Amino acid sequence: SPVRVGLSVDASALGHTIPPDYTGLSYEQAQMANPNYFSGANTQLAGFLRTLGRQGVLRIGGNTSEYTFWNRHAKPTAADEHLAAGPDKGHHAAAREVITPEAVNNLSEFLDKTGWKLIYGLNLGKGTPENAADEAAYVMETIGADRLLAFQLGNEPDLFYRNGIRPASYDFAAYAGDWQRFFTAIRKRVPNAPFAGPDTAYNTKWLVPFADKFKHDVKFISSHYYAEGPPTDPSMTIERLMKPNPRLLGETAGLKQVEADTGLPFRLTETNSCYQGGKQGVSDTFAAALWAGDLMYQQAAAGSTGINFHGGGYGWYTPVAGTPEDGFIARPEYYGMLLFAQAGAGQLLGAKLTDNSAAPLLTAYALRGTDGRTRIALFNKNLDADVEVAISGVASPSGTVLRLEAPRADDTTDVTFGGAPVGASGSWSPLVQEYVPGHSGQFVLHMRKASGALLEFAKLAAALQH
Numbered sequence: 051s052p053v054r055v056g057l058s059v060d061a062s063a064l065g066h067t068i069p070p071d072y073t074g075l076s077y078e079q080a081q082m083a084n085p086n087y088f089s090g091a092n093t094q095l096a097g098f099l100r101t102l103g104r105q106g107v108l109r110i111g112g113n114t115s116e117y118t119f120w121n122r123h124a125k126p127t128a129a130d131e132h133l134a135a136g137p138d139k140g141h142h143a144a145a146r147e148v149i150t151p152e153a154v155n156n157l158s159e160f161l162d163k164t165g166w167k168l169i170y171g172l173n174l175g176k177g178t179p180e181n182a183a184d185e186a187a188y189v190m191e192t193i194g195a196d197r198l199l200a201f202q203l204g205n206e207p208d209l210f211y212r213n214g215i216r217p218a219s220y221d222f223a224a225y226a227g228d229w230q231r232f233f234t235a236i237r238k239r240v241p242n243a244p245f246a247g248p249d250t251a252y253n254t255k256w257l258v259p260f261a262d263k264f265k266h267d268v269k270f271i272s273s274h275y276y277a278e279g280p281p282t283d284p285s286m287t288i289e290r291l292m293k294p295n296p297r298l299l300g301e302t303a304g305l306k307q308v309e310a311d312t313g314l315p316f317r318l319t320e321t322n323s324c325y326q327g328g329k330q331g332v333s334d335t336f337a338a339a340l341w342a343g344d345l346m347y348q349q350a351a352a353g354s355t356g357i358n359f360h361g362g363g364y365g366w367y368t369p370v371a372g373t374p375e376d377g378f379i380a381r382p383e384y385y386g387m388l389l390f391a392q393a394g395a396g397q398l399l400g401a402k403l404t405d406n407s408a409a410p411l412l413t414a415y416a417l418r419g420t421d422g423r424t425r426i427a428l429f430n431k432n433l434d435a436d437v438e439v440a441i442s443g444v445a446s447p448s449g450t451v452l453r454l455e456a457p458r459a460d461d462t463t464d465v466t467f468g469g470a471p472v473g474a475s476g477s478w479s480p481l482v483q484e485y486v487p488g489h490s491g492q493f494v495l496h497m498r499k500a501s502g503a504l505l506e507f508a509k510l511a512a513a514l515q516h
């Protein structure tokens with residue numbers, strides 16, 4: 051029989067605001083070698099982005115951002131017209147790649163079709179300062195100041211000391227040396243160039259020092275998060291993914307500290323379920339939908355201003371898989387992001403769970419949407435326990451629920467949201483939407499084990515609204 055838990059919504063306890071550009075994706079800079087991928091002609095991928103959000107952020111970086119070289123004088127045919135660059139697997143140096151001017155032109159078209167903004171990585175790892183300044187000039191001219199959110203100078207510089215990009219003695223001070231040189235060169239050529247950093251892999255000790263040292267130079271602070279890895283490790287499983295861990299706790303403490311101590315916004319600019327390119331039977335499963343949806347809300351509740359889920363090609367953890375030649379499809383993780391998309395922007399509200407020690411992995415977030423309607427996103431990440439949730443503090447004549455479901459937590463397919471799969475080019479409409487009648491602010495919702503739900507509550511006395 052279900053675990054009976056209480057959910058107390060407190061509309062008077064206002065939390066952080068979820069901005070319209072909260073959602074986002076991350077891709078390898080190596081993708082810029084193929085101008086057909088981020089292109090106005092890539093209507094399928096653009097549709098998947100628009101379904102994820104009217105607004106949102108595309109971040110380009112990753113390990114390959116150290117191995118990609120802008121060449122303003124490249125033959126256009128230097129482009130690899132067939133490349134679908136999956137997440138870097140981090141085992142060794144990536145292939146070097148050239149970025150052509152047409153790739154940047156096509157990226158602008160893609161941003162225009164999607165309505166998304168851009169975070170753009172620059173090659174501080176293996177590139178020169180002059181070439182970074184040239185690259186930044188072209189991107190600023192082509193993408194424009196309205197859509198260019200930030201440049202980032204190097205990806206995960208806290209790992210340079212061990213992956214061969216720098217000597218083993220590389221540390222924060224040395225990175226701050228590197229960063230200052232690149233910054234200055236770029237600003238000389240592009241006086242309005244926006245920046246973010248440090249784009250760190252894990253090392254939260256770099257965050258406040260970076261923010262303090264470069265406070266007047268950056269728009270926001272960024273760091274990364276991967277829940278699990280390596281993939282070959284038998285301890286890295288679906289159940290573990292449903293649980294908090296010390297890394298997440300430190301990253302969360304980390305973002306709170308930098309926001310409190312500096313007043314700069316934080317963005318989680320690269321995240322996914324398992325590093326080294328993800329884990330088959332974990333990252334590509336319905337479990338990842340619950341993981342990602344919940345992470346979006348948990349991060350927002352802690353103060354994050356956005357997220358970028360890493361992906362590309364047919365990578366085990368990619369939200370969207372495919373190529374311009376064969377077409378694109380939503381993987382399971384996409385459906386967690388879709389639940390968030392459907393919930394929309396607004397302001398988080400107090401929502402406390404009780405009597406939940408036998409269902410400890412259930413999470414719930416309450417939101418007053420921009421339109422004034424209360425929503426509740428719930429993730430029953432308990433793999434073995436169904437729950438019955440007694441919801442109080444929501445006064446509405448009624449709510450509807452859209453379910454996030456698959457027949458088993460490890461399914462690589464059969465994933466639906468609101469009773470429907472996502473179709474071609476991001477097409478999605480709910481086909482199953484159940485009612486919940488309520489009284490005195492009280493509602494009772496059952497959820498199967500390993501499932502999600504989005505509740506949307508009706509306005510009071512709004513039946514005859516225009």
Ligand SMILES: O=C(O)[C@H]1O[C@@H](O)[C@H](O)[C@@H](O)[C@@H]1O
Nearest residue numbers: 112113137138140325326327
């Ligand atoms: O290992 C991974 O999956 C990812 O690790 C991150 O640290 C890198 O920035 C990215 O390029 C990789 O794809």
